[PDB]
Symmetry: C3
């Protein structure tokens, strides 16, 4: 699992421990061990959501499996909740794209997971 | 619809109104009201295109529907035109990836669109 | 072909000719002319991999074709090797996502490649 957050909120507004919390919460949500999880947080971005520059985020979650209708609703509740509580971004100014990756299309450690 | 532009043009060369211009023009092109459209512009990037560091852009357009052969050819004209006029990028140094998203794979407001 | 590498290693630790090397090596690996290859390197990122902020990278390679099981294993050896030699990133702290794009979904110069 790989989670990327792009946001216009300033870097100073990202709390200490945020990347750790994301790693832990995504491990619980996906069932995968934390060693597998990558997080990437990108603050201070030039963004608009609905033509407004108020706090917003564009995110993506890539995973080898564990992607689907019900799971994605659960991930959205979790991840919008964290962006609201920790970065003060309204959930209706967040988009999250979910991508189910084939293992043969994910490289790691000089090879692929195929 | 979500439109992302990655470019090596400096931040100071991105007009203040560019995000709003892109929002409005994408609303007209996709038929979706502007409240649904998100835009992200990423300047000052370390990039090469054809082995040259002259101005260039790598872009993505994600949308639930409104993606297809003919539509994508039309979007390329709209977006090349905007990047040429406002960021002074040659249109042969622009790539745009088009992604047709399933509503079940787009999170928003604690849920998904499915 | 389009290759993007996001990393937490500092900008100052990216060698001068790194973009050029990636372009030439991707041309040899993919068989496509360098004039069609785009490269994008993003240092200084806020990232965690397995819960650790030691040097890591999240990358993607997009191509119209030339993506597949054994091919992706070969790309991973090539690219992990370059990230290890030049950026000092351990290969077990690199993920690379491989994307086989339909030509109708790749825009360039006021049209698509279809
Ligand atoms: C998230 S994209 N992690 C990539 C690493 C990885 C390795 C194995 C598996 S498994 N055995 O299919 O659960 C998932 C993810
Ligand atoms: C772009 S990715 N917008 C996502 C939000 C969205 C997309 C489509 C529609 S609709 N009801 O099909 O017009 C609404 C909202
Ligand atoms: C990478 S995504 N390049 C853009 C698409 C593409 C693919 C192949 C060729 S060629 N000249 O036939 O090798 C050009 C452009």
């Amino acid at each position: 699992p790989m989670f990327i957050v792009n946001t216009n909120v300033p870097r100073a507004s990202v709390p200490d421990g945020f990347l750790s919390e994301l790693t832990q919460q995504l491990a619980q949500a996906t069932g995968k061990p934390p060693q597998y999880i990558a997080v990437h947080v990108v603050p201070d971005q030039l963004m608009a959501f609905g033509g407004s520059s108020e706090p917003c985020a564009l995110c993506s979650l890539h995973s080898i499996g564990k992607i689907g209708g019900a799971q994605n609703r659960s991930y959205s509740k979790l991840l919008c909740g964290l962006l609201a509580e920790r970065l003060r971004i309204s959930p209706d100014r967040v988009y999250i794209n979910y991508y189910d990756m084939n293992a043969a299309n994910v490289g790691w450690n000089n090879s692929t997971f195929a």
